């Protein structure tokens, strides 16, 4: 951990906003109960379920390169804690998650194929959102 750089990890992203008024909506409810749940169980979801551990995954420069980390565990907590004001904010966090993967990794990488498959499913599921 000295001679060869091993990296280090930030605290995970914030998942609650104590100042924010509770505002439940049908789209946010659908995002939690259907979209995220469907994405979570996909065969390729596991790498995206928790924050990247730059040290344990041997990605020592991950957090040099990725300034706005995001993962599905964080998105799940944000939906649970009514952190998002609207569906768009939630969608933006999914976009950040996928694009982080594309930014860090090379286009031909296995993890990129996985992210692309999840992203395609996500975009399909987004078409299902209720009419608020
Ligand atoms: C989605 C967060 N994420 C990365 O961007 C990333 C890059 C490289 C490896 C890796 C991993 S890993 O568990 O070390 N390897 C995952 C796999 C790979 O070939 O990268 C191994 C089998 C499936 C994908 C988990 C989450 C990651 C990455």
From Swiss-Prot:
There is a cross-link at residue 64 (Glycyl lysine isopeptide (Lys-Gly) (interchain with G-Cter in SUMO2)). It is linked to Cornelia de Lange syndrome 6: A form of Cornelia de Lange syndrome, a clinically heterogeneous developmental disorder associated with malformations affecting multiple systems. It is characterized by facial dysmorphisms, abnormal hands and feet, growth delay, cognitive retardation, hirsutism, gastroesophageal dysfunction and cardiac, ophthalmologic and genitourinary anomalies. CDLS6 inheritance is autosomal dominant. Belongs to the BET family. It is found in: Nucleus; Chromosome. Chromatin reader protein that recognizes and binds acetylated histones and plays a key role in transmission of epigenetic memory across cell divisions and transcription regulation. Remains associated with acetylated chromatin throughout the entire cell cycle and provides epigenetic memory for postmitotic G1 gene transcription by preserving acetylated chromatin status and maintaining high-order chromatin structure. During interphase, plays a key role in regulating the transcription of signal-inducible genes by associating with the P-TEFb complex and recruiting it to promoters. The record marks 105 as: Acetylated histone binding. The lineage of its organism: Eukaryota, Metazoa, Chordata, Craniata, Vertebrata. Residues 23-129 form the Bromo domain. JQ1, a thieno-triazolo-1,4-diazepine derivative, and I-BET, a benzodiazepine derivative, have been tested on tumors with success. Treatment with GSK1210151A (I-BET151, a I-BET derivative) has strong effets on mixed lineage leukemia and promotes myeloid differentiation and leukemia stem-cell depletion. Coiled coil: none annotated. Transmembrane segments: none annotated. The chain holds residues 44 to 167 of 1362 of the full protein. The NET domain mediates interaction with a number of chromatin proteins involved in transcription regulation (NSD3, JMJD6, CHD4, GLTSCR1 and ATAD5). This is Bromodomain-containing protein 4.
């Amino acid at each position: 951990h000295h001679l060869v750089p091993r990296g280090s990890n930030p605290p995970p992203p914030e998942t609650s906003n104590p100042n924010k008024p509770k505002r439940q909506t049908n789209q946010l409810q659908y995002l939690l109960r259907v979209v995220l749940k469907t994405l979570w169980k996909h065969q390729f979801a596991w790498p995206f379920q928790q924050p990247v551990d730059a040290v344990k995954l041997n990605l020592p420069d991950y957090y040099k390169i990725i300034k706005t980390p995001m993962d599905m565990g964080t998105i799940k907590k944000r939906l649970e804690n009514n952190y998002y004001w609207n569906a768009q904010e939630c969608i933006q966090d999914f976009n950040t998650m996928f694009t982080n993967c594309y930014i860090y990794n090379k286009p031909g990488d296995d993890i990129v194929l996985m992210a692309e498959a999840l992203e395609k499913l996500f975009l399909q599921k987004i078409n299902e959102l209720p009419t608020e």
